[PDB]
Each structure stands twice: as C-alpha cells, then as structure tokens.
Design a protein around this motif. Sequence first.
Motif, short mmCIF file in Angstrom:
data_model
loop_
_atom_site.label_atom_id
_atom_site.label_comp_id
_atom_site.label_asym_id
_atom_site.label_seq_id
_atom_site.Cartn_x
_atom_site.Cartn_y
_atom_site.Cartn_z
N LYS A 20 48.99 31.67 2.87
CA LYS A 20 47.68 31.37 2.33
C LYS A 20 47.79 30.21 1.59
CE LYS A 20 45.65 34.99 0.66
NZ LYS A 20 45.22 36.29 0.14
N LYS A 213 47.45 40.70 7.04
CA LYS A 213 47.59 40.52 5.53
C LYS A 213 49.31 39.90 5.44
CE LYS A 213 43.48 41.56 5.03
NZ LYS A 213 42.61 40.76 5.87
N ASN A 214 49.60 39.57 4.32
CA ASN A 214 51.08 39.40 4.25
C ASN A 214 51.74 41.03 3.96
OD1 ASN A 214 50.47 40.17 1.80
ND2 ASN A 214 51.64 38.61 0.75
N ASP A 216 52.37 43.05 5.97
CA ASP A 216 51.96 43.79 7.03
C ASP A 216 53.09 44.21 7.93
OD1 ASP A 216 49.52 45.72 7.56
OD2 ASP A 216 48.38 43.71 7.64
#
Length: 259
Positions: A20, A213-214, A216
């Motif tokens: 991100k 998402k991170n 995951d």
Amino acid sequence: MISGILASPGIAFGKALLLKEDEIVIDRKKISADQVDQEVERFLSGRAKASAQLETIKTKAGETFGEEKEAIFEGHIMLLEDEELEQEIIALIKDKHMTADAAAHEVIEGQASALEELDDEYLKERAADVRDIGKRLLRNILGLKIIDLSAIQDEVILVAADLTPSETAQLNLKKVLGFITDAGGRTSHTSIMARSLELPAIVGTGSVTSQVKNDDYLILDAVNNQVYVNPTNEVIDKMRAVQEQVASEKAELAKLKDR
C-alpha cells in the motif's frame, strides 16, 4: 477462478504481502521571491541524495542480473543529471513562481508522454521508467517515507498492481517465494524475472489487488492457472499432499533406473 496468463508452472504456499502507498499531493500555491531560493536548495540538494540512491541501485541491477541491466539504469541516471533538464526546472520555479514539486512534475509530464509517441519497445518502456524517476524525486523533496521491500523477514508471496524495474532490481529473490501482479504480461518486467529465475509466477491477475489484503492466506497453483483465496484447512491438507506428491513423483523418475 482468477485465471491469469501463467508465467511459470509450480505450486507455492505463503501469506499475501499487499504493497500500500500513500498518494502524493502536489501543492499548487504560488510562492514569493522570498521562498524561491529555498526551493532551489531542496531540488539541488535533493538531487544530491536521489543521485546517491539511484546510483547505488544501479550496481544492484548489475550484481543481481548482470551487466545487461546496468546499461538501462545507467541511462536513467544520465537523465536526472542532465544539465539541460536542470536549467529548465529551475527556470519554471523562478519564471513561473512554481514549487519544486510542481515545476518538476511539469517537465516529467512531457518527458513521459513524449517517449510514448515513439513506436519502440525500449523507448516506450523508457516512458514508464522515466515516470518512476520523477515519482522518487517527489518523495525526496517532501521527505515522504520510502518503503524498504528489501527489509522482509518472513517468506511470503509478493502481490502488487505492478512493479517498476528499480523496485525489481532491489527486490530480494531469497525472501520472495513468487510474484503475482495485475500486469498485461506481454512486456511486463516481472514476467522477464520469472523466465530467468523460472520461479512460478502470474501477471494477469486482473484486479486481485482490489480484493486481497496483506497477510491473507493464498495458495499459488500455477498448474491449473488458478489462485485460492481463504481456502479451508480441508482443502489445504488436500493440496499439501498432491502438491508434494508431485515432487515425490519426480524423484520417482529417479527410480526408473531400478526398473
């Protein structure tokens, strides 16, 4: 059901590492001849640091991939150190009372679009690689934090909409178990990494970066060209056997000698 273009065959397990980034906001406020002198220091002194940073990566591209990529990164530094683009950027700040971030973005706006008018795979890709040079300079003028991707400690999967040569030149191939991005795949620099490293990879993920998402838990199959998101343990245990059963089936080929 996410079908990509399949860059290399293989199976890997790892958490999703999402990258991100904070969007950069340019200030369009007009300064007075009093702060103009200060912008020159941030740009002149700024290049002093960016020149040192990009200069270091250059060797990382030649020591990691070979002298073949050093020539591409060597040309990028030449652009930043061009005494021509320097006199222009400065003229815009003193002639148009523009900020260092705003004036710098203007020049970079035409240097990228101009390379896009050329019909060459090198000059074109140079368009995207040049935009990356100005983006970095912008983060140094505002003092924005830089993401250190080479500071990973846990082996995980790398997921990103796209990676630029520089980031790929400094990426750590020992901590990354594979690459999965949303790039076309034809002239994607990542794909070229997968072919030389033969590591399993995918690029036509489409919009996985907008659905993951991170941290995951994802399984890369690179076999049936499919990625599993949030799989149940029952599925995992089922893949851990077959998958490893392949590596054993390969070693079984070594047994065709005892037959």
